[PDB]
Amino acid sequence: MKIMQVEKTLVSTNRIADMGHKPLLVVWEKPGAPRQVAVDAIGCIPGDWVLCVGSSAAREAAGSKSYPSDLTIIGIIDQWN
Amino acid sequence: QSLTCEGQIISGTSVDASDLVTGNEIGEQQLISGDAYVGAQMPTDFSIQTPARSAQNRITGPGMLATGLITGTPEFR
Amino acid sequence: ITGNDIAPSGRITGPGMLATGLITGTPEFRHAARKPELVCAPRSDQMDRVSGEGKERCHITGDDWSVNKHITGTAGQWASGRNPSMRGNARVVETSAFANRNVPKPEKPGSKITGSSGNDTQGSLITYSGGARG
Amino acid sequence: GIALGMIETRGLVPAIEAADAMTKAAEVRLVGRQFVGGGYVTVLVRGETGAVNAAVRAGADACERVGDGLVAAHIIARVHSEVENILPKAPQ
Amino acid sequence: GIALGMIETRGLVPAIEAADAMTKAAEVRLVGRQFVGGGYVTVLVRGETGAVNAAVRAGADACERVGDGLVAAHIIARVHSEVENILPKAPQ
Amino acid sequence: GIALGMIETRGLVPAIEAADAMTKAAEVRLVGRQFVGGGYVTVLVRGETGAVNAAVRAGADACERVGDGLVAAHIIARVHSEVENILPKAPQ
Amino acid sequence: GIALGMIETRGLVPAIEAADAMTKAAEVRLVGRQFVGGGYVTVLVRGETGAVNAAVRAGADACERVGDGLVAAHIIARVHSEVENILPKAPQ
Amino acid sequence: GIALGMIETRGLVPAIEAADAMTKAAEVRLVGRQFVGGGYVTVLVRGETGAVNAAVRAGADACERVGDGLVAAHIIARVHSEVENILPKAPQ
Amino acid sequence: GIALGMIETRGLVPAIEAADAMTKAAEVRLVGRQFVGGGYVTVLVRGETGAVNAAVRAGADACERVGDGLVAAHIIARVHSEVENILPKAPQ
Amino acid sequence: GIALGMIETRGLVPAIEAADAMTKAAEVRLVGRQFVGGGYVTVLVRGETGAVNAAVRAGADACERVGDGLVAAHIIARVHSEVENILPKAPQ
Amino acid sequence: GIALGMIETRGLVPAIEAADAMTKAAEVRLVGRQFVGGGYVTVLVRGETGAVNAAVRAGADACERVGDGLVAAHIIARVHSEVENILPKAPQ
Amino acid sequence: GIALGMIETRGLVPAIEAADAMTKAAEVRLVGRQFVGGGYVTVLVRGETGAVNAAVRAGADACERVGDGLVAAHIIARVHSEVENILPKAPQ
Amino acid sequence: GIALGMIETRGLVPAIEAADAMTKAAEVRLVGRQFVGGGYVTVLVRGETGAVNAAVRAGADACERVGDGLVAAHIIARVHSEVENILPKAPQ
Amino acid sequence: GIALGMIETRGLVPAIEAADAMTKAAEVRLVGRQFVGGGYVTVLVRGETGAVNAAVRAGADACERVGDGLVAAHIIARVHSEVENILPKAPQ
Amino acid sequence: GIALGMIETRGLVPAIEAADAMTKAAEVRLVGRQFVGGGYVTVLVRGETGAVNAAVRAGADACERVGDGLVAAHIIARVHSEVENILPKAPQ
Amino acid sequence: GIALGMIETRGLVPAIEAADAMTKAAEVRLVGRQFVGGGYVTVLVRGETGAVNAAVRAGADACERVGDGLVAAHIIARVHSEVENILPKAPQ
Amino acid sequence: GIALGMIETRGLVPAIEAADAMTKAAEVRLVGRQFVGGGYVTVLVRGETGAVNAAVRAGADACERVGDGLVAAHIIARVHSEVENILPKAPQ
Amino acid sequence: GIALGMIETRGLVPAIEAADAMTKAAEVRLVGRQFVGGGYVTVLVRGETGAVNAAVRAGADACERVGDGLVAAHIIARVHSEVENILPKAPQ
Amino acid sequence: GIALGMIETRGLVPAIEAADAMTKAAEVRLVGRQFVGGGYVTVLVRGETGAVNAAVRAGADACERVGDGLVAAHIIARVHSEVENILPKAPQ
Amino acid sequence: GIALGMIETRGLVPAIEAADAMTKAAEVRLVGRQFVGGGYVTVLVRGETGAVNAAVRAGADACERVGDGLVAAHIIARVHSEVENILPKAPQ
Amino acid sequence: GIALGMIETRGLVPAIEAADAMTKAAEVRLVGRQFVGGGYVTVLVRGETGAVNAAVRAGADACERVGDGLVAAHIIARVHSEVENILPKAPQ
């Protein structure tokens, strides 16, 4: 897992039907780092340092193991620096 | 020859009543209790009947008269 | 009670004649004191005659354009009976894609090719030149 | 008020009771109470034909069991001009 | 006219119905109503002989049912001059 | 004359009719119509003894079935002077 | 004449017969005639006690047959001074 | 003397016999006579509680036979101030 | 208070006992006594609603067996403003 | 008056009703109320012999069914001067 | 008069009847009325031994049937000087 | 008119149809529409007693099977002045 | 308020609960409590008759199961002037 | 008037019938009509304790069959002083 | 003396007979009469033991019959100094 | 346009979708949405009778599957001038 | 303290253990002990509602068997302001 | 000592015997005697707990069969300060 | 006090019976009443923790039977400062 | 953004959760939250069709287990100009 | 903090206890209580997610058995800026 800031709220209305519709949040290793993206299982507001799980861990983090997620947000660091 | 209430022979001067003495025989009554002065010769309830206690120890008004005679504005039941 | 009566009876028909049993507080009531689950039909069960607006599956109620059987005209005998017509028995044979969805198609021999053949048996729908499956 | 509604009764208790039930029930004015003699008391109520019918019917039921009951409960939709002379204009 | 039509009826409610029916269903005029006392109330109409006959019959049938009902209904086609003194005479 | 014939009747319709028969039949002068109360209504005529007898018989035969009926029909040929005070001098 | 003589009758015709028979039989004055109500009429005569007994007896027999009948026939030889205030002084 | 003894009778004759008996047999003043109508006449006499009882038994016995007879004989030992308004004050 | 108590009786002797019992028993004012006719007499006690019910109850038992009896005993807690006209406001 | 009317009852509540009906029914003064002890309460009235008799009979009937009941209802027409000392002169 | 006569009773009504009969019969002064408690009332008289003998007998017959009755009746011709202290000197 | 007609319904759609049938059927003015809560909508009309009766009956029939339906359809020929304070004078 | 309502209980505990239930229930004023003796304790309230009825009914039910129970519950719609001297009064 | 009659109903049509009945039955003012929500409407009246008792029963009987009907019928003869703050004073 | 002869009786009359017989028989001195309550009246005497025994037996025999009777008869040859504090010292 | 189209629904979301379809389907104007309460929301359109019929049918099928559903779909081809007042003229 | 706890017991020995147990268990101030009469003693305490409830429970349980038992045990959390007068302010 | 001892009895003769027995047995001081009323008499004797227990046993046995018997026999080893007020501190 | 008591009830009628029995029963003050909606009316009374407890059991028994019934009854020994904002400060 | 997302729910907690899930999932302006009545709360959003679809799908799943579920979840790509009037502009 | 603690219940009484428990357990500020309608009452607190997570668990347990029950209990860690517009800021 890794602490990553939320930059914006990604929207794709032509995504695979297997995704159902979880929230999506563009994530930042930090501002100025690659804008990777996560399925926001734990609700996070833009401008929030949020820990993101990855691999098969991200998939069962969302509804199902078959769920198509490589990065999921599994929390928000209560206080982060 | 005198006895106490519990059966103690008292053997000396007797104040117990005699056939030949007349002034003494005013009472041969067990009713005298407490200290015993003469020889052979449970209470659990008030013995007076205070009248309030004798009487076993709903509303009576102008409104309880004329039960069927009256017709009128109906009052809540 | 005697004299002129405003009490309701059938011979003198009108507004007073209707809604007996729903009305209360009427001089008669005071003397005595002394449906379908869905507005619209099941969607699957009913195929409407005219579709879109003009659908009758929904029970719109009150001053609607529906005409009951007692009302006659502008439909049925009044439109159909106007023009003489005769339907003839025609051998109905349709040659089209939907009709040919089930045409007899010959047995498809698969691909026995091996080695760097991107062919997948799931993707055998494809045919290569010469009619060769895979 | 035009329609006359009259409830006769045997006594002034059945009639006052009936009169209270007529004026309360519908928009009718009590135009008078007449002591007919012989124990008959009449209560006449003048109002629109519909109000009078409601008032008399309510009064009839109310005073039936009160003492000696109603002798009459007539509703006249429109009394003739000549009859108005013998009707009381106001109560005394 | 001279003919007289009297309808005695027990109570003032039957009398008022009778008066209404007599004055409406004929050309008679309501000379007056006299509370006899003892419960009876008479309604008298003076008019033509033909009109009085129709008035009494119409009044009799109308109120026979109302209240206690009809005691008497009589036509006097001509009343002697002496018997016109103990009548209501002028209606008002 | 001073003979007093008097026909009491149950109600005023049988009295206003006995009065018509009594004054029409013989030469008698209707002197009053008194409401006794209880329903009774006594119609008095004063005239010659022979005429009064004829009148009362006429009045009596006329009012027998006209209504509730006739209570009395009495002829007093002379009346004491004391009785004059209670008797009606002229009708109303 | 302190002694009083009263003859209530069920009607004015019986009462007038009684009054004629009473004031004719003995020297008694017709002090008054009252209408009690309910058909009852009383005739009172004040006279000497002998003249009152004779008058009342004669009046009772004469008017017993007349009309509805005779209610009561009572003689009071002396009336208390308090009772005099409820007695009619002069006939009306 | 605030007690009131009322004797009702069916007629004036029994009432005057009762009032004569009531005032003769007790120190009870005669406070008035009432014509109730329907024939009833009420003779009210007001005095001491003991005297009123004596007056109303004497009155009841006297008028129990005369005329139609006694309807009611009642003794009210004290009369509330409000009731005295409807009571006859005194003929005097 | 505006409640109306009513006790009709078959006489005045039962209506005075009734009136005394009603006024004595509760705080109700005796507004009037009305001789209806036919021998019926009515005593009215306007007061508060609790007081009037008690007053009409006391009046009922006291005069139920006095004389003929009580024809009616009726309670109206509120009488319409129109009925107030026919109601007697002060006793006579 | 000087006659003494006493009612002893079991309780204060029966005594207040017995006293209320003694002073309402008849013209008797309430001279005092005594708590005998044992749950007995006497009610003494002083007045005329006739008033006391009527008062003691009204009071007795009123308190027979109130609470535990009536023990005694006695009337003494004359009380000796020695007995006056034990009597309550003024109510307390 | 040193002789003491005492009538105990169950209530003040029997006691007052007894005191009245005792003071009326003979010349004995009512020296006290003591409320024993539990409903017992004792009336005491002091007089001549003959006057006390006559008084208590009369009181015994008087209160036996009054109220609850007579508990006791005693006559002592002379009381010991020490016993006189407990006796009431004057009726309080 | 002062008579009040009232069709309560479950919903505004059943009440507007009831409001339209009432105003069209009779001479009634729609005085207000009130949202009771719990999905109840009461449409109140005012007008003559006869007209209001005609309006309510027609309105009840029209809205009986519109939406959830009719809860109540009542007529009050006269409403006390106090109830008029909870009635809306004109609709919004 | 003049009416008086009294609840008599065997013991002080039921009486205080009665006086608490009677005063809280309706617009009655606890004037005072009296220790009759023998255990009887009477709590008296004073107020408008309807309020007293609501209070005496409330206080009876309140103390009926408390302690020994109820001896008597009573209402007097009006208390005579003489009685008030023997009533606790002194609400203070 | 302190007594709080309060008739909760389901709808404003059962509440306006009940309110009419309550205001008409007795002298009570419609202090306030409250929309509780969930389609409950509570009419509250305030009057003397007897007038409130009569009004509540009349309102309970009148609207039991009007619309959905009666939810509750309660009479508080004297509400606590703290409670008075939450109760409505004039209908809004 | 120091001995205490007591005789409790059901009434003051029995108690006074007992006290009279006790003080006369022996040299005992009446030390006081105590009202226990509920009908019990104790009589205490104090003298030499032999005298107390003679007095108690004489007193018990004399007053056993008198009135309700004798509850107790006790002799205490010596009373402890502490008991003398509750003992009545002397009537004087 | 005068015809009124109504689609009651359970909740705002079915109503907004219903209004979306009704305005889109035919040329009708949304005269307003009223939150009836109890979770009912009414969408109102006013337009031509033919157009409103299309809008009501289009809205009824759209909102039936959206959310809780449609309570009712109604049309009023001609709204009376009196109904107009309670109809909202324009949401904005 | 406002809450009042009252244990009435037949005799003072069962009311000294009732009071010892009551005071000890909780913080309560013994306001008074009252000999009602007839063998009844009432120990009253005033304090906080929690303390009074715990106290009276302790006192009732302790005296149920001591001597004669407890007639009553009662808790009134806020006796009305009128009832404060009858409650003893301090024990004597 | 601080312990209390108590022997209620039905009379002053059993109470005095019990007091003598209690004081003569152990080192206990009679602190007084209270007349409960109803015949009950309580003896309160204080001392060391063991002495009081022996004294109470001796007291109960001495007076168990004398006069009316024993009611209560209680021992408290320590009483509260509040209880001291109701207790008689000094013999009297 | 700072403790908070609350009684939710379905309807205003149950909430006022509950509020009237909460303030009457124990030492609590109505701090306000809020209409929750959906037919629930929560009542709030604040006082000493024992008084608020006694108020909410008394109130719960009072309104469980009145109206629909009792949704909740609760006591908060001490209320946090933040919550006090949402609580009603006072109806005043 | 013209498209209107909506999510009706049975309660506010489910609705606020849905709104948090809708605004976090996509860039959509939460235009308003509406309390529909009867427990229905509708949170509306306005944004691009793709953003609205992502939001309303995200909100529906998130609030589908939060208490009572989602009544509805609706996506409108294009809203008619007429509908925009009833749509909220900014949250209130 | 920014996290929102939400508890919806069926009544105000379950919500206030829930809010007492939420504010008492952790440092969370009560930012408002909303009345959803339909009986649902929501409470909102704004504090750090640790405080909101600890508080909500406490409130959900505290009101689970209180009243009707708990409908929802949710924790949002970070409430989007857009949703903050539909959150109460301070309690009303």
Residue numbers in the entry:
A (entry chain U): 1 to 81
B (entry chain X): 607 to 647, 685 to 700, 712 to 731
C (entry chain Y): 702 to 735, 770 to 869
D (entry chain E), E (entry chain G), F (entry chain D), G (entry chain H), H (entry chain C), I (entry chain F), ...: 6 to 97
From the primary publication:
Among diverse BMCs, carboxysomes are specific CO2-fixing BMCs found in all cyanobacteria and many proteobacteria. The carboxysome uses a polyhedral protein shell to encapsulate the key CO2 fixation enzymes, ribulose-1,5-bisphosphate carboxylase/oxygenase (Rubisco) and carbonic anhydrase (CA). Carboxysome shells are typically composed of three groups of structural components that form hexamers, pentamers, and trimers. Here, we generated recombinant α-carboxysome shells of Halothiobacillus neapolitanus by expressing all the shell proteins (involving three CsoS1 hexameric proteins and two CsoS4 pentameric proteins), together with the C-terminal domain of CsoS2 (CsoS2-C) that mediates shell assembly.
